[PDB]
Amino acid sequence: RSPDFRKAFKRLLCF
């Protein structure tokens, strides 16, 4: 899977 990518999208969203 790609959890990290989703997290980074989550992360990116926060920024």
The span from the CA of 15 to the CA of 11, in Å, is: 7
Cβ count within 10 A of residue 3:
7
Q: How many residues does the chain have?
A: 15
What is the CA angle 7-11-15, rounded to 5?
170
CA-derived radius of gyration, the chain? 7
CA distances to 6, 10 from 13, rounded to whole Å, are: 10, 5
Residue showing tokens 């790609």: 2
Q: Return phi, psi of residue 2, to 5°.
A: -125, 70
* Secondary structure in 3-state letters for 1-15: CCHHHHHHHHHHHHC
